[PDB]
Amino acid sequence: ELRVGLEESELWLRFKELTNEMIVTKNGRRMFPVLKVNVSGLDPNAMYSFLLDFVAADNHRWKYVNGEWVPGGKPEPQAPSCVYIHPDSPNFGAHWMKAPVSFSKVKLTNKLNGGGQIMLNSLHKYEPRIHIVRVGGPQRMITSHCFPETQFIAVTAYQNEEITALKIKYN
Numbered sequence: 001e002l003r004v005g006l007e008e009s010e011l012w013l014r015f016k017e018l019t020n021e022m023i024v025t026k027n028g029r030r031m032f033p034v035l036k037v038n039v040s041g042l043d044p045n046a047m048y049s050f051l052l053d054f055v056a057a058d059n060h061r062w063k064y065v066n067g068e069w070v071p072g073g074k075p076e077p078q079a080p081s082c083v084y085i086h087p088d089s090p091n092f093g094a095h096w097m098k099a100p101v102s103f104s105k106v107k108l109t110n111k112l113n114g115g116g117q118i119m120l121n122s123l124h125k126y127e128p129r130i131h132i133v134r135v136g137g138p139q140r141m142i143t144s145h146c147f148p149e150t151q152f153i154a155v156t157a158y159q160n161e162e163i164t165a166l167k168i169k170y171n
């Protein structure tokens with residue numbers, strides 16, 4: 001059976017219990033912590049691409065009000081995020097299972113850009129999600145996995161200084 005697991009969950013849970021924030025910039029900012037995924041149960045000889053997107057967890061704008069995050073009154077439909085292709089893609093099952101798949105080079109932006117960068121809406125809450133994509137033929141398959149532990153609000157600067165401190169402590 002194809003098994004997907006989060007590497008360093010105990011660390012992500014420190015961020016999650018404070019409400020996690022990720023910086024977005026015009027040119028794009030890399031994530032900390034980095035999403036790292038443990039994958040077993042692939043065909044070592046089959047061909048796969050690893051894809052990363054961000055699901056809007058709710059339809060609301062969030063704001064830091066008197067030391068705490070609160071959702072706004074007026075929900076809007078959240079268009080799905082664009083997909084980031086892991087740069088090792090496409091690759092053999094063996095490549096993906098030999099070490100954690102690390103999305104260290106994805107950059108989160110707030111502006112529509114040349115490409116590479118993934119544009120998110122600031123003050124929206126996101127749930128990272130991967131798609132493992134077995135390419136070509138009649139054996140083609142997608143398996144998707146969400147990482148609730150890795151939820152964050154996109155921000156142009158940190159609001160909760162406890163997050164600022166954890167980011168620095170562990171970087």
Ligand SMILES: CC(C)N(C)S(=O)(=O)N1CCO[C@H](C)C1
Binds near residue numbers: 134135136137141142
């Ligand atoms: C676009 C193309 C290169 N593919 C990844 S596919 O094999 O035709 N394909 C797309 C949907 O997911 C499955 C893996 C089947």
